[PDB]
Amino acid sequence: MERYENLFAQLNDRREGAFVPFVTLGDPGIEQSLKIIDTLIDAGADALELGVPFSDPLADGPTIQNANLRAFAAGVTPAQCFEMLALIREKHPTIPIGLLMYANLVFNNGIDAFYARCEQVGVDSVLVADVPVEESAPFRQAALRHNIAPIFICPPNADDDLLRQVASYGRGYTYLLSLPLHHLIEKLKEYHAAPALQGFGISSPEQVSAAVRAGAAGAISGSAIVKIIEKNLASPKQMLAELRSFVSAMKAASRA
């Protein structure tokens, strides 16, 4: 989790927001994915959120569903994803890397062993999509024992008890899906929560600047990067160019 603390301190010194793209590991194949991820960082991504393909995702929208399926077409396995993660970390010492996992892939061979493997490959955070704070204890605990930030979603439907819990239990950043937006941000700060990244449908520069004005620490683009991959499957070159352009623009909007 320390990579997040250092990142946010540095961004705060530059009076800058974070821009964090999501991509599925191994979409549309392992080698193209590694190139995509390098392009995102080179173009200005401050941190990454990376998905591991899962057979039966019940919490992803169509764009992500389709990416999930492509990565299977390339035969991508969790083992291969962890090989990719070690490579990515070896190239990029300071970029925080967060995973977006389904519970069964964490639970499969033992929760502790999952987080130990995350630590070995140099992952910084894990968001488990289908584990609410109410069920989070063994995940949080294993994350913290292995120096991994457990990330929690703060939903639009969030009450005070939930704000207090997410503030208490989360580390790294709070994943905000956005009661009034600036109010949630104020309450999360009152409760000493991890810095908030707004993740609701972030697809344009003006939403990044809006997030920064609302006093969030930055913005996560949950599916816009994946859409670019999907549109450009026939041309890997054009794919990288359009991803570079998009990320450049989004990061520019964070420099507020």
């Binding site: 899962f54 057979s55 039966d56 995702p57 019940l58 919490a59 992803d60 929208g61 169509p62 569903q65 389709n66 999930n68 399926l69 396995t77 969790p78 083992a79 389904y102 519970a103 069964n104 892939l105 639970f107 499969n108 061979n109 999509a129 289908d130 584990v131 609410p132 704070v133 109410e134 069920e135 929690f152 979603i153 703060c154 939903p155 639009p156 439907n157 939930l162 899906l177």
Partner: protein
Amino acid sequence: TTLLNPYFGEFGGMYVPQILMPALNQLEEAFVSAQKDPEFQAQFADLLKNYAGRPTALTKCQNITAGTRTTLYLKREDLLHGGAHKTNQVLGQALLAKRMGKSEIIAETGAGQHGVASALASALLGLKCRIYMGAKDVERQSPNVFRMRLMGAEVIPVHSGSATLTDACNEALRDWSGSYETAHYMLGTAAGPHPYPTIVREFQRMIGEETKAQILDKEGRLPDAVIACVGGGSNAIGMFADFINDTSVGLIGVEPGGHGIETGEHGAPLKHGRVGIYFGMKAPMMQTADGQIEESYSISAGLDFPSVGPQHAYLNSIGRADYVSITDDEALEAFKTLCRHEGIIPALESSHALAHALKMMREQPEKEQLLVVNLSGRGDKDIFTVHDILKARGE
């Protein structure tokens, strides 16, 4: 917090995205309230009796058991409106939706049996029903799609992902996550996140309650065992629940063995899978070594799932219930046996339960035993499947 325990031992829970927790909490509160409300109970009793036709018969089957010391009764859920026990709990959940002030129902369906049950409850109660169905499934299920549409449901083809059940379920839950103020998600078995395993059991428990009363009237005792097939677990938990504290009564759940457990082509996760977390619950599931969910198989679509409800896993773990498997071939023989000797065409799902009872009898024909099979549905739907198989192997 919750009002009720979400777990059965180590199994169950609420493994959903945070955004869905208020919907589950709302549903739990409404269920707890309803269970205390005599008016709700009376409304539910009225629909079960006057619309669905409860109580269902308990039939003593003499030809099948002739020359043995087995006495075999069939609990006739095949006679319920809709042709299967599914009708019981969709009526209850529809009444819960109305209690919460909702006018809309979301369901998903693969082969279409739960879709038809959801559509019929919605039609009766004047609810707007949308049923998500993978595009590949719509193409293969014209009869059930047509039944749902005749009953006024909107059947929504899902083309994203693999365009099958997983994708339909995702879309249904995505819908629900946004619309839960106005729409209720009508889960079709005793599985998924709390409170559904609890609700579905309580809205199916009249199976076992009636069976107990009927067998006390007819035989003056309790059964030696009650035997039910296990897809997700609703008809079996409905049959078992009222007997759990009757420690002398055997509870036998029958999972589909497909082509044989050793082939890997089966749907028997309780005895031959591994605990995992999926579909909102910690429960036995069929899994790859690296934790992907395996494809299941059964001749019977109603049993063909790679997981099972958490209360069954718990009852197994403590030794209160025993779980066995029956192959496609065994189920087919039972199906033929009931048609010929009792004039009842059973669902292929239910045929797995009957096959295991037939084995208990034939293996030990001088053992005195009083058995009840949950005959979960009728088998009109299965005659083409059966014909095609019998013709293929030449018999």
